[PDB]
Amino acid sequence: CSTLSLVRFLELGLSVACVCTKFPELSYVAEGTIQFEVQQPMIARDGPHPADQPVHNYMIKRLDRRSLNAAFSIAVEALGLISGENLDGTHISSAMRL
Amino acid sequence: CSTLSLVRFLELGLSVACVCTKFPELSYVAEGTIQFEVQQPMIARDGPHPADQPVHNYMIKRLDRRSLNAAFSIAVEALGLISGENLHISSAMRL
Secondary structure, eight states, X not given: OOOOOXXXXXXXXXXXXXXXXXXXXXXXXOOOEEEEEEEXXXXXXXXXXXXXXXXXXXXXXXXOOOOOBOOOOOOHHHHHHHHTSSOOSOHHHXXXXX | OOSSOOOOGGGSSSTTTSOOOOOGGGTTOOSOEEEOOBOOOOOXXXXXXXXXXXXXXXXXXXXXXXXXXXXXXXXXXXXXXXHSOOOOOSOTTXX
16 A cells, blocks of 8 residues: 655745735635835035936735635545444454445 | 584574564465454644545465475485395495
């Protein structure tokens, strides 16, 4: 029998690329934003060339959305055996349930 | 064996390839078999399509028969000489 080697995203080196925050309410959330402000350092220089005023700017960035997905099934016989509905007083049945 | 000089099979670098195991009752054996099973790891997709359903495999193999022979011979009176226990009796050089 082969066992699958499970991997955890936090242990990979790629984890340092992004920062992940668990957000248990994302289903209710329509578009979200983030706010940016930044002020450029200026330089005072001699002459008629404009030694201009400092510059501000306010950039906003919008949030995108995508979703993962995965599926699997369980047969009906297994459903009965697990539920405890079909088990009989036979050792042969407990083996199948296991 | 200590006084002999043999090339034992379990000292080369070749032994590390096959897992030898002694089996006395190999002769009373019909088709010998062996089983396998694997789960292949899956990854979740983006567009929902209900067709991933992690697979299951059950491989099976069979044994292959093979022999290994060796010959040996001796004369008939030749053996007869080693039977008697004698201390000459005019047969040493022959014995």
